[PDB]
Amino acid sequence: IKCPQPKTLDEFTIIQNLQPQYQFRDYFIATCKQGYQLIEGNQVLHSFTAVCQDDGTWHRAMPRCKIKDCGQPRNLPNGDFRYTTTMGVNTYKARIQYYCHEPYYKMQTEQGVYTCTAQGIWKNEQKGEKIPRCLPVCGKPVNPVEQRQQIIGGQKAKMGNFPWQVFTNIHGRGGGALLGDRWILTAAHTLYPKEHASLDVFLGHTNVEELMKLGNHPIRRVSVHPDYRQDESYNFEGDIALLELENSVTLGPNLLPICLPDNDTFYDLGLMGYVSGFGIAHDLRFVRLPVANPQACENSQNMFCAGHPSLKQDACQGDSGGVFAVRDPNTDRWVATGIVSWGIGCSRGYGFYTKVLNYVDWIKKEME
Ligand SMILES: *[C@@H]1O[C@H](CO[C@@H]2O[C@@H](C)[C@@H](O)[C@@H](O)[C@@H]2O)[C@@H](O[C@H]2O[C@H](CO)[C@@H](O)[C@H](O)[C@H]2NC(C)=O)[C@H](O)[C@H]1NC(C)=O
């Protein structure tokens, strides 16, 4: 007819339905303060109810209330996190901080702070239960072309110089630029040559053999801009394409994306940019040339001319599908202003190029 008016085994247990005395058939309930869960031996309990049996004894043993554990923080692809609290303890109230592998990636928004909630899972000051996202940083080579030089003509390209450079080889050697994590910008005629599929694509290195040793990157999808017409002898309008990599590449010092242009001034006469390509020249080379007066090439409005006559062959460095890159110092970022297009007359000193700014919209649309 009586049970022992019982007590907690710690400061984390709380008694529910507490009475002055406990008669047979009665019951009391146990729970825990925030952050603590009911444990019985080596077992978590959703709840605890003890009924007072006739022999005057509680049908079950008072449980214990222990701290909860949010477990091992999820992994942040291209980043990492550190404990901001005793290291390695994923217990209630612990605090960790995620971060990205800068300078190559940047965290998508101290916002990578997740603490272990009373609910037993890592959460943000309102960034959810979801972890941050580390994004590819575009146009900031970690070994950029020295500006302390203006070396007229072709130069041997060093590693890190054009980290976005893509060596293509589908219907002949071609080029392209890595955009983001998984896109390569290039020319349409590179995939569909005019005058009449195995998309062999390589990246990450200055040397061709080394590039090929690094391995091909499978293309998952191809997008040729709607204008581009190949049956027509010469239009070069819409000569631009996008390739989507089946898998994404890992950024680093020799493999980084280039940025997209957005201001018309990237096509002002006299503005210096760069062009890189192979010639299988065995090694990647580059030329610094200026945006030339359209007549220069005339001799479209979705294109631009670049070169100088005192350059002869050196104005054919770009590989077709390759990118005309500009270093915008008022933001210190490299952008892809042009796409190497029909190279007729590049030995007279000038190159033709598709104006990328005019297709940024379409590109971005394709990339989503
Ligand atoms: C559109 O571009 C203008 C040109 O900016 C220059 O050329 C870019 C390609 C890049 O290399 C940048 O670093 C250069 O400054 C830009 O600047 C123009 O206006 C500013 C006033 O804000 C003036 O100081 C500057 O001299 C101008 N540029 C020129 C031709 O010298 C302009 O602000 C920009 N606007 C847009 C649409 O964002």
Side-chain angles (χ1 to χ4, degrees), residues 183-222:
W183 305 83
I184 80 203
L185 183 59
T186 186
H189 77 242
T190 257
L191 277 145
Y192 296 77
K194 291 178 166 186
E195 299 186 300
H196 181 287
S198 188
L199 297 182
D200 299 347
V201 182
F202 311 85
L203 316 100
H205 198 102
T206 265
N207 173 262
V208 180
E209 177 195 58
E210 279 310 86
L211 261 160
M212 294 196 287
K213 278 177 186 178
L214 275 170
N216 77 303
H217 287 79
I219 298 314
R220 161 169 182 286
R221 291 188 173 189
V222 187

mmCIF file of all heavy atoms in Angstrom, residues 183-222:
data_model
loop_
_atom_site.group_PDB
_atom_site.id
_atom_site.type_symbol
_atom_site.label_atom_id
_atom_site.label_comp_id
_atom_site.label_asym_id
_atom_site.label_seq_id
_atom_site.Cartn_x
_atom_site.Cartn_y
_atom_site.Cartn_z
ATOM 1 N N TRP A 183 32.056 23.947 -65.414
ATOM 2 C CA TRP A 183 31.654 24.381 -66.729
ATOM 3 C C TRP A 183 32.819 24.838 -67.535
ATOM 4 O O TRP A 183 33.716 25.476 -67.010
ATOM 5 C CB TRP A 183 30.661 25.530 -66.620
ATOM 6 C CG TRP A 183 29.485 25.197 -65.768
ATOM 7 C CD1 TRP A 183 29.395 25.260 -64.398
ATOM 8 C CD2 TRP A 183 28.265 24.647 -66.225
ATOM 9 N NE1 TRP A 183 28.184 24.763 -63.985
ATOM 10 C CE2 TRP A 183 27.473 24.379 -65.090
ATOM 11 C CE3 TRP A 183 27.758 24.355 -67.493
ATOM 12 C CZ2 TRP A 183 26.204 23.833 -65.184
ATOM 13 C CZ3 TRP A 183 26.495 23.817 -67.589
ATOM 14 C CH2 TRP A 183 25.727 23.558 -66.436
ATOM 15 N N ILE A 184 32.860 24.477 -68.805
ATOM 16 C CA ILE A 184 33.946 25.032 -69.593
ATOM 17 C C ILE A 184 33.301 25.832 -70.738
ATOM 18 O O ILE A 184 32.391 25.355 -71.434
ATOM 19 C CB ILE A 184 35.016 23.945 -70.068
ATOM 20 C CG1 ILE A 184 34.510 23.189 -71.266
ATOM 21 C CG2 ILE A 184 35.315 22.890 -68.921
ATOM 22 C CD1 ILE A 184 35.180 21.840 -71.403
ATOM 23 N N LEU A 185 33.713 27.094 -70.828
ATOM 24 C CA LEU A 185 33.253 28.021 -71.846
ATOM 25 C C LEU A 185 34.178 27.822 -73.040
ATOM 26 O O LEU A 185 35.403 27.682 -72.879
ATOM 27 C CB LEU A 185 33.398 29.456 -71.338
ATOM 28 C CG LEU A 185 32.882 30.557 -72.260
ATOM 29 C CD1 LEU A 185 31.408 30.347 -72.522
ATOM 30 C CD2 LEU A 185 33.118 31.905 -71.608
ATOM 31 N N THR A 186 33.613 27.819 -74.234
ATOM 32 C CA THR A 186 34.421 27.605 -75.420
ATOM 33 C C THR A 186 33.659 28.045 -76.652
ATOM 34 O O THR A 186 32.580 28.579 -76.542
ATOM 35 C CB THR A 186 34.740 26.127 -75.551
ATOM 36 O OG1 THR A 186 35.659 25.926 -76.634
ATOM 37 C CG2 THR A 186 33.487 25.374 -75.814
ATOM 38 N N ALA A 187 34.210 27.791 -77.828
ATOM 39 C CA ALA A 187 33.532 28.176 -79.060
ATOM 40 C C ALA A 187 32.694 27.049 -79.636
ATOM 41 O O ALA A 187 32.991 25.863 -79.449
ATOM 42 C CB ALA A 187 34.534 28.602 -80.079
ATOM 43 N N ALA A 188 31.653 27.420 -80.366
ATOM 44 C CA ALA A 188 30.779 26.421 -80.975
ATOM 45 C C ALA A 188 31.465 25.647 -82.114
ATOM 46 O O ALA A 188 31.300 24.428 -82.255
ATOM 47 C CB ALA A 188 29.533 27.101 -81.484
ATOM 48 N N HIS A 189 32.265 26.361 -82.903
ATOM 49 C CA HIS A 189 32.933 25.767 -84.050
ATOM 50 C C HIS A 189 33.946 24.751 -83.642
ATOM 51 O O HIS A 189 34.507 24.027 -84.444
ATOM 52 C CB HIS A 189 33.570 26.853 -84.902
ATOM 53 C CG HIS A 189 34.841 27.407 -84.351
ATOM 54 N ND1 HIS A 189 34.978 28.731 -83.986
ATOM 55 C CD2 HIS A 189 36.076 26.861 -84.245
ATOM 56 C CE1 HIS A 189 36.245 28.979 -83.688
ATOM 57 N NE2 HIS A 189 36.932 27.860 -83.838
ATOM 58 N N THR A 190 34.169 24.700 -82.354
ATOM 59 C CA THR A 190 35.104 23.762 -81.801
ATOM 60 C C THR A 190 34.436 22.408 -81.662
ATOM 61 O O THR A 190 35.100 21.381 -81.702
ATOM 62 C CB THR A 190 35.592 24.312 -80.480
ATOM 63 O OG1 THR A 190 36.901 24.845 -80.687
ATOM 64 C CG2 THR A 190 35.560 23.283 -79.387
ATOM 65 N N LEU A 191 33.114 22.431 -81.522
ATOM 66 C CA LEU A 191 32.305 21.232 -81.387
ATOM 67 C C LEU A 191 31.646 20.894 -82.700
ATOM 68 O O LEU A 191 31.410 19.722 -83.017
ATOM 69 C CB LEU A 191 31.221 21.461 -80.360
ATOM 70 C CG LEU A 191 31.691 21.253 -78.931
ATOM 71 C CD1 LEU A 191 30.991 22.236 -78.044
ATOM 72 C CD2 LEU A 191 31.394 19.841 -78.486
ATOM 73 N N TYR A 192 31.321 21.948 -83.442
ATOM 74 C CA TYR A 192 30.669 21.822 -84.739
ATOM 75 C C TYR A 192 31.425 22.697 -85.689
ATOM 76 O O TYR A 192 31.075 23.862 -85.883
ATOM 77 C CB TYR A 192 29.209 22.284 -84.682
ATOM 78 C CG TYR A 192 28.352 21.428 -83.786
ATOM 79 C CD1 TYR A 192 28.411 21.557 -82.392
ATOM 80 C CD2 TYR A 192 27.525 20.445 -84.320
ATOM 81 C CE1 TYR A 192 27.670 20.721 -81.556
ATOM 82 C CE2 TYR A 192 26.777 19.597 -83.491
ATOM 83 C CZ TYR A 192 26.858 19.740 -82.115
ATOM 84 O OH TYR A 192 26.155 18.895 -81.293
ATOM 85 N N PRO A 193 32.507 22.157 -86.266
ATOM 86 C CA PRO A 193 33.279 22.973 -87.203
ATOM 87 C C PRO A 193 32.508 23.273 -88.493
ATOM 88 O O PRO A 193 31.696 22.471 -88.987
ATOM 89 C CB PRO A 193 34.535 22.136 -87.429
ATOM 90 C CG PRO A 193 34.031 20.732 -87.259
ATOM 91 C CD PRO A 193 33.127 20.832 -86.069
ATOM 92 N N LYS A 194 32.728 24.465 -89.013
ATOM 93 C CA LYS A 194 32.083 24.829 -90.249
ATOM 94 C C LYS A 194 32.941 24.174 -91.348
ATOM 95 O O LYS A 194 34.027 23.657 -91.066
ATOM 96 C CB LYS A 194 32.032 26.356 -90.366
ATOM 97 C CG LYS A 194 31.067 27.019 -89.356
ATOM 98 C CD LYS A 194 31.080 28.558 -89.461
ATOM 99 C CE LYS A 194 29.903 29.223 -88.739
ATOM 100 N NZ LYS A 194 29.848 30.705 -88.983
ATOM 101 N N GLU A 195 32.456 24.177 -92.586
ATOM 102 C CA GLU A 195 33.174 23.552 -93.694
ATOM 103 C C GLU A 195 33.315 22.049 -93.415
ATOM 104 O O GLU A 195 34.198 21.382 -93.946
ATOM 105 C CB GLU A 195 34.535 24.224 -93.883
ATOM 106 C CG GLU A 195 34.408 25.708 -94.212
ATOM 107 C CD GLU A 195 35.732 26.365 -94.538
ATOM 108 O OE1 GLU A 195 36.628 26.365 -93.668
ATOM 109 O OE2 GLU A 195 35.874 26.883 -95.666
ATOM 110 N N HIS A 196 32.415 21.549 -92.563
ATOM 111 C CA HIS A 196 32.309 20.143 -92.154
ATOM 112 C C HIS A 196 33.595 19.387 -91.807
ATOM 113 O O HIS A 196 33.794 18.951 -90.654
ATOM 114 C CB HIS A 196 31.522 19.391 -93.222
ATOM 115 C CG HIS A 196 31.308 17.944 -92.925
ATOM 116 N ND1 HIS A 196 32.319 17.009 -93.012
ATOM 117 C CD2 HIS A 196 30.187 17.256 -92.604
ATOM 118 C CE1 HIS A 196 31.825 15.808 -92.766
ATOM 119 N NE2 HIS A 196 30.534 15.930 -92.516
ATOM 120 N N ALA A 197 31.006 12.228 -80.151
ATOM 121 C CA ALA A 197 31.975 12.914 -81.011
ATOM 122 C C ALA A 197 33.348 12.857 -80.342
ATOM 123 O O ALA A 197 34.362 13.289 -80.905
ATOM 124 C CB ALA A 197 31.543 14.378 -81.219
ATOM 125 N N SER A 198 33.341 12.294 -79.133
ATOM 126 C CA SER A 198 34.508 12.155 -78.275
ATOM 127 C C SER A 198 34.973 13.536 -77.842
ATOM 128 O O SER A 198 35.739 14.226 -78.550
ATOM 129 C CB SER A 198 35.645 11.426 -78.987
ATOM 130 O OG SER A 198 36.682 11.149 -78.060
ATOM 131 N N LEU A 199 34.478 13.963 -76.687
ATOM 132 C CA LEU A 199 34.884 15.246 -76.191
ATOM 133 C C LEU A 199 36.037 14.979 -75.260
ATOM 134 O O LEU A 199 35.833 14.585 -74.107
ATOM 135 C CB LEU A 199 33.727 15.928 -75.472
ATOM 136 C CG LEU A 199 32.546 16.223 -76.405
ATOM 137 C CD1 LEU A 199 31.464 16.930 -75.635
ATOM 138 C CD2 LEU A 199 32.985 17.091 -77.569
ATOM 139 N N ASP A 200 37.254 15.108 -75.795
ATOM 140 C CA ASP A 200 38.416 14.932 -74.948
ATOM 141 C C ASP A 200 38.797 16.260 -74.325
ATOM 142 O O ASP A 200 39.165 17.229 -75.006
ATOM 143 C CB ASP A 200 39.554 14.293 -75.728
ATOM 144 C CG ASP A 200 39.165 12.922 -76.251
ATOM 145 O OD1 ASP A 200 38.132 12.364 -75.809
ATOM 146 O OD2 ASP A 200 39.870 12.362 -77.106
ATOM 147 N N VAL A 201 38.673 16.298 -73.003
ATOM 148 C CA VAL A 201 38.952 17.535 -72.286
ATOM 149 C C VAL A 201 39.948 17.392 -71.123
ATOM 150 O O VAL A 201 39.799 16.522 -70.258
ATOM 151 C CB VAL A 201 37.626 18.142 -71.758
ATOM 152 C CG1 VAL A 201 37.905 19.444 -71.051
ATOM 153 C CG2 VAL A 201 36.607 18.358 -72.935
ATOM 154 N N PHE A 202 40.958 18.260 -71.094
ATOM 155 C CA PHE A 202 41.956 18.214 -70.039
ATOM 156 C C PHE A 202 42.149 19.571 -69.387
ATOM 157 O O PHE A 202 41.896 20.611 -70.009
ATOM 158 C CB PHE A 202 43.266 17.701 -70.618
ATOM 159 C CG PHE A 202 43.103 16.468 -71.423
ATOM 160 C CD1 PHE A 202 42.759 16.547 -72.758
ATOM 161 C CD2 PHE A 202 43.213 15.228 -70.832
ATOM 162 C CE1 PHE A 202 42.518 15.396 -73.506
ATOM 163 C CE2 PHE A 202 42.975 14.077 -71.557
ATOM 164 C CZ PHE A 202 42.624 14.161 -72.912
ATOM 165 N N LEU A 203 42.613 19.552 -68.140
ATOM 166 C CA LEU A 203 42.823 20.778 -67.393
ATOM 167 C C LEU A 203 43.850 20.595 -66.307
ATOM 168 O O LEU A 203 44.262 19.501 -66.012
ATOM 169 C CB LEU A 203 41.547 21.200 -66.679
ATOM 170 C CG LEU A 203 40.140 21.193 -67.265
ATOM 171 C CD1 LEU A 203 39.411 19.977 -66.800
ATOM 172 C CD2 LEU A 203 39.373 22.404 -66.773
ATOM 173 N N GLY A 204 44.248 21.698 -65.696
ATOM 174 C CA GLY A 204 45.138 21.612 -64.567
ATOM 175 C C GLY A 204 46.612 21.682 -64.792
ATOM 176 O O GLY A 204 47.364 21.631 -63.826
ATOM 177 N N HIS A 205 47.061 21.798 -66.030
ATOM 178 C CA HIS A 205 48.509 21.858 -66.221
ATOM 179 C C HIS A 205 48.923 22.599 -67.463
ATOM 180 O O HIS A 205 48.211 22.674 -68.449
ATOM 181 C CB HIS A 205 49.116 20.440 -66.262
ATOM 182 C CG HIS A 205 50.598 20.402 -66.020
ATOM 183 N ND1 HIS A 205 51.152 20.037 -64.804
ATOM 184 C CD2 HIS A 205 51.640 20.709 -66.829
ATOM 185 C CE1 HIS A 205 52.468 20.126 -64.875
ATOM 186 N NE2 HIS A 205 52.789 20.532 -66.093
ATOM 187 N N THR A 206 50.110 23.158 -67.385
ATOM 188 C CA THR A 206 50.718 23.903 -68.469
ATOM 189 C C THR A 206 51.189 22.989 -69.612
ATOM 190 O O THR A 206 51.007 23.303 -70.777
ATOM 191 C CB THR A 206 51.889 24.662 -67.893
ATOM 192 O OG1 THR A 206 51.434 25.971 -67.575
ATOM 193 C CG2 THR A 206 53.100 24.688 -68.848
ATOM 194 N N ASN A 207 51.804 21.856 -69.267
ATOM 195 C CA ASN A 207 52.312 20.922 -70.262
ATOM 196 C C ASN A 207 51.279 19.940 -70.780
ATOM 197 O O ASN A 207 50.535 19.345 -70.015
ATOM 198 C CB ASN A 207 53.485 20.141 -69.698
ATOM 199 C CG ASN A 207 53.935 19.048 -70.635
ATOM 200 O OD1 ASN A 207 53.566 17.866 -70.494
ATOM 201 N ND2 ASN A 207 54.711 19.440 -71.634
ATOM 202 N N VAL A 208 51.268 19.726 -72.084
ATOM 203 C CA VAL A 208 50.282 18.843 -72.691
ATOM 204 C C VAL A 208 50.292 17.400 -72.260
ATOM 205 O O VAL A 208 49.246 16.802 -72.043
ATOM 206 C CB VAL A 208 50.382 18.825 -74.234
ATOM 207 C CG1 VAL A 208 49.320 17.875 -74.807
ATOM 208 C CG2 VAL A 208 50.196 20.208 -74.783
ATOM 209 N N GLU A 209 51.480 16.821 -72.207
ATOM 210 C CA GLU A 209 51.588 15.440 -71.828
ATOM 211 C C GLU A 209 51.160 15.334 -70.392
ATOM 212 O O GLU A 209 50.408 14.440 -70.043
ATOM 213 C CB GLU A 209 53.013 14.972 -71.966
ATOM 214 C CG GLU A 209 53.211 13.546 -71.520
ATOM 215 C CD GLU A 209 54.664 13.216 -71.320
ATOM 216 O OE1 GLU A 209 55.311 13.912 -70.507
ATOM 217 O OE2 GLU A 209 55.158 12.269 -71.971
ATOM 218 N N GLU A 210 51.632 16.254 -69.560
ATOM 219 C CA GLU A 210 51.270 16.244 -68.156
ATOM 220 C C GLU A 210 49.762 16.413 -67.971
ATOM 221 O O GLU A 210 49.158 15.785 -67.070
ATOM 222 C CB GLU A 210 52.031 17.330 -67.393
ATOM 223 C CG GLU A 210 53.458 16.958 -66.996
ATOM 224 C CD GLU A 210 53.597 15.594 -66.286
ATOM 225 O OE1 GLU A 210 53.714 14.554 -66.966
ATOM 226 O OE2 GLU A 210 53.599 15.557 -65.043
ATOM 227 N N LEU A 211 49.167 17.244 -68.828
ATOM 228 C CA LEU A 211 47.735 17.522 -68.796
ATOM 229 C C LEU A 211 46.975 16.267 -69.096
ATOM 230 O O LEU A 211 45.962 15.954 -68.464
ATOM 231 C CB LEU A 211 47.358 18.528 -69.862
ATOM 232 C CG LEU A 211 47.176 19.999 -69.554
ATOM 233 C CD1 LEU A 211 47.298 20.734 -70.871
ATOM 234 C CD2 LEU A 211 45.823 20.274 -68.857
ATOM 235 N N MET A 212 47.446 15.568 -70.114
ATOM 236 C CA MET A 212 46.831 14.322 -70.520
ATOM 237 C C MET A 212 47.067 13.236 -69.479
ATOM 238 O O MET A 212 46.252 12.349 -69.300
ATOM 239 C CB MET A 212 47.386 13.924 -71.871
ATOM 240 C CG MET A 212 46.951 14.928 -72.899
ATOM 241 S SD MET A 212 47.140 14.369 -74.562
ATOM 242 C CE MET A 212 48.977 14.490 -74.686
ATOM 243 N N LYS A 213 48.173 13.315 -68.762
ATOM 244 C CA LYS A 213 48.420 12.296 -67.780
ATOM 245 C C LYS A 213 47.461 12.513 -66.675
ATOM 246 O O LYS A 213 47.051 11.547 -66.034
ATOM 247 C CB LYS A 213 49.852 12.350 -67.251
ATOM 248 C CG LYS A 213 50.874 11.652 -68.139
ATOM 249 C CD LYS A 213 52.264 11.809 -67.571
ATOM 250 C CE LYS A 213 53.335 11.253 -68.508
ATOM 251 N NZ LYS A 213 54.716 11.448 -67.957
ATOM 252 N N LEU A 214 47.090 13.776 -66.449
ATOM 253 C CA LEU A 214 46.125 14.126 -65.383
ATOM 254 C C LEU A 214 44.768 13.523 -65.639
ATOM 255 O O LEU A 214 43.972 13.389 -64.727
ATOM 256 C CB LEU A 214 45.957 15.644 -65.235
ATOM 257 C CG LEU A 214 46.975 16.351 -64.348
ATOM 258 C CD1 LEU A 214 46.909 17.856 -64.432
ATOM 259 C CD2 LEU A 214 46.720 15.865 -62.972
ATOM 260 N N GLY A 215 44.495 13.211 -66.901
ATOM 261 C CA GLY A 215 43.240 12.571 -67.259
ATOM 262 C C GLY A 215 42.116 13.404 -67.825
ATOM 263 O O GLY A 215 41.916 14.558 -67.459
ATOM 264 N N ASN A 216 41.357 12.791 -68.715
ATOM 265 C CA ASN A 216 40.231 13.465 -69.335
ATOM 266 C C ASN A 216 39.066 13.709 -68.346
ATOM 267 O O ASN A 216 38.896 13.002 -67.347
ATOM 268 C CB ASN A 216 39.719 12.618 -70.507
ATOM 269 C CG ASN A 216 38.882 11.393 -70.042
ATOM 270 O OD1 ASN A 216 39.349 10.524 -69.262
ATOM 271 N ND2 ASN A 216 37.633 11.329 -70.526
ATOM 272 N N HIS A 217 38.266 14.726 -68.633
ATOM 273 C CA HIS A 217 37.097 15.043 -67.823
ATOM 274 C C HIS A 217 35.877 14.836 -68.674
ATOM 275 O O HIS A 217 35.650 15.534 -69.667
ATOM 276 C CB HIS A 217 37.142 16.476 -67.368
ATOM 277 C CG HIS A 217 38.152 16.707 -66.304
ATOM 278 N ND1 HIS A 217 39.494 16.828 -66.571
ATOM 279 C CD2 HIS A 217 38.027 16.785 -64.961
ATOM 280 C CE1 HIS A 217 40.154 16.973 -65.437
ATOM 281 N NE2 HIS A 217 39.287 16.950 -64.445
ATOM 282 N N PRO A 218 35.082 13.848 -68.320
ATOM 283 C CA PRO A 218 33.877 13.551 -69.074
ATOM 284 C C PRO A 218 32.840 14.661 -69.186
ATOM 285 O O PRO A 218 32.467 15.290 -68.225
ATOM 286 C CB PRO A 218 33.361 12.346 -68.361
ATOM 287 C CG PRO A 218 34.599 11.641 -68.044
ATOM 288 C CD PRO A 218 35.486 12.693 -67.521
ATOM 289 N N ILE A 219 32.366 14.910 -70.384
ATOM 290 C CA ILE A 219 31.371 15.941 -70.538
ATOM 291 C C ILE A 219 30.010 15.299 -70.387
ATOM 292 O O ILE A 219 29.728 14.265 -70.978
ATOM 293 C CB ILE A 219 31.513 16.634 -71.913
ATOM 294 C CG1 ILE A 219 32.882 17.295 -71.994
ATOM 295 C CG2 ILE A 219 30.477 17.688 -72.080
ATOM 296 C CD1 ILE A 219 33.238 18.104 -70.719
ATOM 297 N N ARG A 220 29.173 15.904 -69.558
ATOM 298 C CA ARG A 220 27.805 15.432 -69.329
ATOM 299 C C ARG A 220 26.787 16.084 -70.289
ATOM 300 O O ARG A 220 25.854 15.439 -70.708
ATOM 301 C CB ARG A 220 27.400 15.722 -67.890
ATOM 302 C CG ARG A 220 25.922 15.700 -67.676
ATOM 303 C CD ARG A 220 25.501 15.730 -66.204
ATOM 304 N NE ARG A 220 24.039 15.652 -66.078
ATOM 305 C CZ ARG A 220 23.190 16.654 -66.347
ATOM 306 N NH1 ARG A 220 23.641 17.840 -66.748
ATOM 307 N NH2 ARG A 220 21.875 16.454 -66.266
ATOM 308 N N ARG A 221 26.971 17.355 -70.633
ATOM 309 C CA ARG A 221 26.044 18.039 -71.522
ATOM 310 C C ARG A 221 26.760 19.099 -72.310
ATOM 311 O O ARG A 221 27.745 19.677 -71.847
ATOM 312 C CB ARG A 221 24.937 18.782 -70.760
ATOM 313 C CG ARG A 221 23.879 17.987 -70.024
ATOM 314 C CD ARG A 221 22.795 18.966 -69.529
ATOM 315 N NE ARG A 221 21.654 18.275 -68.940
ATOM 316 C CZ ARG A 221 20.520 18.872 -68.587
ATOM 317 N NH1 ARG A 221 20.369 20.177 -68.758
ATOM 318 N NH2 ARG A 221 19.530 18.157 -68.072
ATOM 319 N N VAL A 222 26.209 19.405 -73.482
ATOM 320 C CA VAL A 222 26.786 20.426 -74.337
ATOM 321 C C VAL A 222 25.692 21.430 -74.679
ATOM 322 O O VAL A 222 24.571 21.039 -74.955
ATOM 323 C CB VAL A 222 27.352 19.803 -75.659
ATOM 324 C CG1 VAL A 222 28.100 20.855 -76.460
ATOM 325 C CG2 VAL A 222 28.270 18.653 -75.355
#
